[PDB]
Design the sequence.
């Protein structure tokens, strides 16, 4: 039932996944197990999320029960910022493999086009914004391409099946494509009615790069983090344009918001933190939006970005 | 006096210059010669402007009459998109040198973070959007850093005093800073009240990069090219906010638009096509805008971009 998308690398990636950011450590395993029982097969995780050991427990538990085999589960992870230097890339990937308890991850992405100064894993893991000097941010001179080549070597070594990037603007992705032997199979960016970036999406899809949207419900996710910007933003669930389209097809606003992406070939990985949501978030491909619908939603685009490195330390990623 | 800006390369750069774009070949020489007579010292040129040979005639004549010495003239040039591949960098720079009839250029900029397929000089010069296959665009897989390194070597050979980039968004600039040995001394971008990109300016300036603004008069220059977008945009010269501020200080809208940038440490290179504009465009530093003025002008920022590769061939530079 859940459509697969064929990546430029030859492997299939489910179009509907399970988000693991801010997935509580104490219940991470159980939630992953339930998601697997509910039908999810792609798990979008990350070194920075700090819950890979658990995500691993969930997947292993399902595998041990015979519900699924390793090849049926699609595991996505992300290289955190302190590990861009080539000499530390495999190290970080190993930590990820050890925590997830597997021989390979299906998708590994450069989490951010930012290079924090390396912090040994034994000193602090996950490091988050720590750069080895108290609260200060510290960076290291590592061009993306260097990190990317380190990743290509790891694909040949069999530790990764497909590699990609996250939070990359158009210019950066274009340049990376000039030096890449293995083309980034995936581009994972914040995508929702308030931040549509139609041109970025067009370029990437045309280049054969698969788009995975994150924070498909816009401000919601950051509201849960008490972020001021998100709090001051009218929810997409209660937006007049969204409710209308929802009523028209007798669907829920949440279903329209996910369909809006899916129908354009964009993979989604919603955070389903309630049994009911687990079902809701993978059964929305039951209707089609019309051109008129898309034009109406396209109007909501105001370039409102909630996940912005500029907020951390004025990093110019999206300026 | 036109104050100078000490570049990170250590060399001084006139904070006000003479734009050479669209400067006709038949009169380019005379115009530059006159600008020199009127006090201008920086001349922003470009291989793509197709008039470097004439810009040289103007300076040579000024030198021959003893009006100035080579040391006193600041010549800026830009490496066009078909010459990114390293081996073509020195040939292109040389054609610029022979054309300008000088031994070195004070500033050489990567014109665009776009690498067009090389086209021999003798086949067409300047090539513009010509890529060697009729009207089709063809590109080269040459990462920015490859080109950048090619430029650094030329600085060592004493053929360029300072190097920099033009039309580089934030992410891309940050990534070059990681691979650059010689940091980009300059960043030249479209900059006017309709496209302020304040964060880009802030980041660049804090990284020690100098900002050179172009199209300081908004849609004006592109209105003189019959560009749809420019013609359907209220000129900054008539705009209520500028008009009011200009009236307040008994200055023309052009003086207000130029001071808006200069006061913020940004270099300007207006195109003075008339004897009076020539003078005025270099005598506007006679008043300061107030905090309130900046606040009012800041409201004009709608991120309206006139020079966009997206229009050429949907090149994702600014998306
Ligand atoms: N690479 C990155 O930079 C990055 C950044 C953010 C998120 N992600 C990934 O994408 C995932 C999804 O993004 P997100 O975590 O911000 O959350 P989201 O946007 O998917 O959902 C946010 C919130 O809305 C609620 N919600 C979910 N489904 C709902 C439904 N059907 N009805 C009503 N409310 C519902 C939940 O409370 C949830 O916490 C993450 O778990 C993570 O894996 C990646
Ligand atoms: N690197 C790049 O990508 C790039 C792109 C465009 C321009 N540039 C450079 O920067 C310069 C500025 O850009 P531009 O020439 O497009 O536009 P501009 O802002 O210099 O001026 C645009 C037009 O307004 C008029 N104008 C000039 N001074 C005036 C005054 N005092 N009062 C009223 N009208 C006036 C002229 O007719 C002129 O053609 C160029 O000459 C060129 O050297 C660089």
Sequence:
């Amino acid at each position: 039932s859940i459509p697969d998308i064929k990546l430029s690398s030859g492997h299939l990636m489910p179009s509907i996944g399970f988000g693991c950011w801010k997935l509580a450590n104490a219940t991470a395993g159980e939630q992953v197990y339930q998601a697997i029982k509910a039908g999810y097969r792609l798990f979008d995780g990350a070194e920075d999320y700090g819950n890979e050991k658990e995500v691993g427990d969930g997947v292993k538990r399902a595998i041990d029960e015979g519900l699924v085999k390793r090849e049926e589960i699609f595991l996505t992870s992300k290289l955190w910022n302190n590990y861009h230097d080539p000499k530390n890339v495999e190290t970080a990937l190993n930590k990820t493999l050890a925590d997830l308890k597997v021989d390979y991850v299906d998708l590994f992405l450069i989490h951010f086009p930012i290079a924090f100064k390396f912090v040994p894993i034994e000193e602090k893991y996950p490091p988050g914004f720590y750069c080895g000097d108290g609260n200060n941010f510290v960076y290291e001179d590592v061009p993306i391409l260097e990190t990317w080549k380190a990743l290509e070597k790891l694909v040949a070594a069999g530790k990764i099946k497909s590699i990609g990037v996250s939070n990359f603007p158009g210019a950066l992705l274009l340049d990376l494509l000039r030096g890449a032997t293995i083309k980034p199979a995936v581009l994972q960016v914040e995508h929702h009615p308030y931040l549509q970036q139609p041109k970025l999406i067009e370029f990437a899809q045309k280049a054969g790069v698969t788009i995975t949207a994150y924070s498909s419900f816009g401000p919601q996710s950051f509201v849960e983090m008490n972020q001021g910007r998100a709090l001051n933003t009218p929810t997409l669930f209660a937006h007049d344009t969204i409710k209308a389209i929802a009523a028209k097809y007798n669907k829920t606003p949440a279903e329209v918001l996910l369909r809006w992406a899916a129908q354009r070939g964009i993979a989604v990985i919603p955070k389903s933190n309630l049994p009911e949501r687990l079902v809701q978030n993978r059964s929305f491909n039951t209707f089609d939006l019309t051109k008129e619908d898309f034009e109406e939603i396209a109007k909501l685009d105001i370039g409102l970005r909630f996940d912005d490195p500029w907020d951390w330390d004025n990093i110019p990623i999206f300026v």
User: Anything to note?
Assistant: Chain A has one domain: 1-319.
